[PDB]
């Protein structure tokens, strides 16, 4: 996260860290949608251009963390993956269209003041909240700047959703409906944006209707970290809501 700030303890009981066994290192962010299901960006597990095609038995899911490097004893919980699921129509070849994927744990995780699942949106929720101007919250353990390096504890940043037109005029990449960009305008004064290391993390919005939190987007891609004129594109979770349900129903 660029231009963010340390998170409050237990501020994201659904945040997840995709941990690479050997060599031990942060892979991506993720989110806990169930006591056994974790959602994440699809380019964290598969991305040929960079020779990335992680196999389930290659990672670990660290849930309930605030620290990036320290094994927060008595708090966090490390779980193992049973099966990885990537969207069958995931465009890693062109513009990362449908950059979504799930991860079923081998053993369900136990909730607590630090580990709690987030709500997935419904047509209604998504309808009234996904609007340009409406701020959302992004958090992760990624870079602090485009080029310090990593942070000590989980970073957070509230960003405003941007209009379709604007997003499309900020890049040369084909912007589809399965995605939306968020960020502050050069004039607006405020900054902030996700960055390498934040991928997979959750973009959430707290519903003013029932005060429950919802994950509207998944950190997907970007061109540089926090550059004026440049925004951040997140997976449009609800549009992919059907595939998610199908994957959990069948399994």
């Amino acid at each position: 996260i660029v231009e963010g700030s340390d998170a409050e303890i237990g501020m994201s009981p659904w945040q997840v860290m995709l941990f690479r066994k050997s060599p031990q290192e942060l892979l991506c962010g993720a989110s806990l949608i169930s006591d056994r299901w974790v959602l994440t960006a699809a380019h964290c597990l598969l991305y040929p251009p960079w020779d990335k095609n992680f196999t389930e038995n290659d990672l670990l899911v660290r849930i309930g963390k605030h620290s990036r490097t320290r094994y927060e004893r008595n708090i966090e919980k490390i779980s193992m993956l049973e099966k990885i699921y990537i969207h069958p129509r995931y465009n890693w070849r062109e513009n990362l269209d449908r950059d979504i994927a799930l991860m079923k744990l081998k053993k369900p995780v136990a909730f607590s003041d630090y580990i709690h699942p987030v709500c997935l949106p419904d047509r209604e929720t998504a309808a009234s909240l996904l609007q340009a101007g409406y701020k959302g919250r992004v958090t992760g353990w990624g870079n602090l700047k485009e080029t310090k390096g990593q942070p000590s504890v989980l970073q957070v940043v509230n960003l405003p959703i941007v209009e379709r037109p604007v997003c499309k005029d900020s890049t040369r990449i084909r912007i589809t409906d399965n995605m939306f960009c968020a960020g502050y305008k050069p004039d607006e004064g405020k900054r902030g944006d996700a960055c390498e290391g934040d991928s997979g993390g959750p973009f959430v919005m707290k519903s003013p209707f029932n005060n429950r939190w919802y994950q509207m987007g998944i950190v997907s891609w970007g061109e540089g970290c926090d550059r004026d004129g440049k925004y951040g594109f997140y997976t449009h979770v609800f549009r992919l809501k059907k595939w998610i349900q199908k994957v959990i129903d069948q399994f």
Partner: peptide, 11 residues
């Protein structure tokens, strides 16, 4: 990397 060691039982 600069990460604390994770207990063996999980590997």
């Amino acid at each position: 990397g600069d990460f604390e060691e994770i207990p063996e039982e999980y590997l």
